């Protein structure tokens, strides 16, 4: 039919892409250790798509476009909502790192306490590194960056709302109790904005699978592997 | 019924955890070792030697440094029952033989 052809074509395209990606990885690990046949041009690991899929897409695209022709910027106001290649929450990360370091220095000199400047400079440095790695959102560093940023802002919110700030101690015991102040609110807005944008990367890191996930798996070697790991190598597989 | 079907297909690991792993292999052995070491006076025959025999008889395998049972026994039993005294023993009997008193 016309409905099974699409299924076949999507299967084929996905498989071609997976094989080209596995090739890029294995060729990189073989060329970074010498054994490559010397006709290998190391700029091929930059062709992302696949040669076959690319030729198909180019042909289809030119056919489509040939058969259809049988602040403020008043020429485009929606300049921010355009893909530039970096994470959306990128200038917020750097802005918050600058604000953190500035407040740390200011308050810790104007009082004499050594905690606020250490916290502020550590937070600023880690958020600056994160906002640097977030400048290429397609790659793997572009994902580990958002991870690090979320972790740091979450730790800030935690320390504020659960232990409070050393320089905010008073004589009473109900007034020197930890509440949520401005910097915690900003850090929370940051974590929420990170989660609502894209944090879906590196999704193959989780706890390993149980013998409860491989009970109805259609493969015997995988299930035997999982049982062996979790301590059940002797149980009989009457399966 | 449809909701229970969709929810059962996405939570096999958590289900097996809570039904087979949570108590029998995580909480019960911790509790048993801590309980035994809370009782059982501070000797070595009671704090280390008999625990090993009974653990191998029960679990059916000896606790080696590759297992968490060995390390739990070591820390709790040895370090907090016999070490604060065998330390004084060695500091008063074996260290004088060597150079520093």
């Amino acid at each position: 039919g016309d409905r099974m052809s699409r299924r076949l074509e999507d299967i084929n395209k996905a498989e071609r892409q997976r094989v080209w990606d596995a090739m890029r990885v294995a060729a990189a690990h073989r060329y970074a250790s010498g054994q490559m046949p010397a006709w290998f041009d190391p700029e091929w690991l930059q062709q992302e798509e696949a040669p076959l899929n690319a030729m198909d897409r180019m042909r289809g695209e030119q056919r489509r476009i040939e058969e259809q022709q049988q602040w403020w910027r008043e020429d485009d106001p929606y300049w921010p909502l355009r893909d530039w290649g970096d994470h959306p929450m990128r200038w917020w990360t750097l802005a918050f790192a600058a604000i953190m370091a500035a407040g740390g220095l200011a308050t810790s000199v104007a009082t004499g306490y050594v905690e606020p400047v250490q916290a502020g400079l550590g937070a600023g440095a880690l958020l600056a590194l994160a906002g640097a790695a977030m400048s290429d959102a397609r790659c793997v560093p572009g994902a580990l960056g958002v991870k690090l940023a979320w972790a740091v802002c979450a730790l800030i919110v935690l320390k504020e709302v659960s232990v409070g700030w050393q320089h905010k101690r008073k004589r009473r015991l109900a007034a020197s109790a930890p509440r949520l102040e401005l910097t915690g609110l900003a850090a929370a807005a940051l974590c929420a904005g990170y989660m609502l944008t894209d944090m879906s990367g590196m999704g193959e890191v989780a706890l390993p699978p149980n013998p409860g996930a491989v009970f109805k798996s259609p493969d015997v070697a995988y299930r035997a592997s999982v049982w062996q790991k979790w301590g059940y190598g002797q149980v009989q597989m009457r399966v | 019924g449809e909701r229970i079907w969709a929810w059962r297909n996405r939570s096999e690991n958590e289900r097996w955890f809570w039904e087979v792993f949570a108590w029998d292999r995580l909480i019960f052995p911790i509790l048993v070792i801590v309980a035994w070491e809370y009782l059982v006076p501070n000797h070595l025959v009671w704090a280390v030697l008999a625990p090993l025999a009974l653990l191998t008889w029960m679990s059916g395998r000896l606790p080696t440094p590759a297992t968490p049972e060995f390390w739990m026994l070591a820390y709790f039993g040895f370090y907090r029952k016999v070490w604060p005294d065998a330390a004084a023993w060695l500091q008063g009997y074996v260290v004088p033989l060597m150079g520093f008193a």
């Binding site: 390993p208 790991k229 979790w230 | 019960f28 309980a35």
Partner: peptide
């Protein structure tokens, strides 16, 4: 090649339970 996890302690007997109330 196993994991770092406990074993069952009650596939053989029950006596270990006698330890929880007493300590309690």
């Amino acid at each position: 090649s196993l994991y770092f996890v406990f074993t069952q302690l009650n596939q053989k007997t029950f006596l270990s339970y006698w330890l929880l109330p007493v300590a309690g």
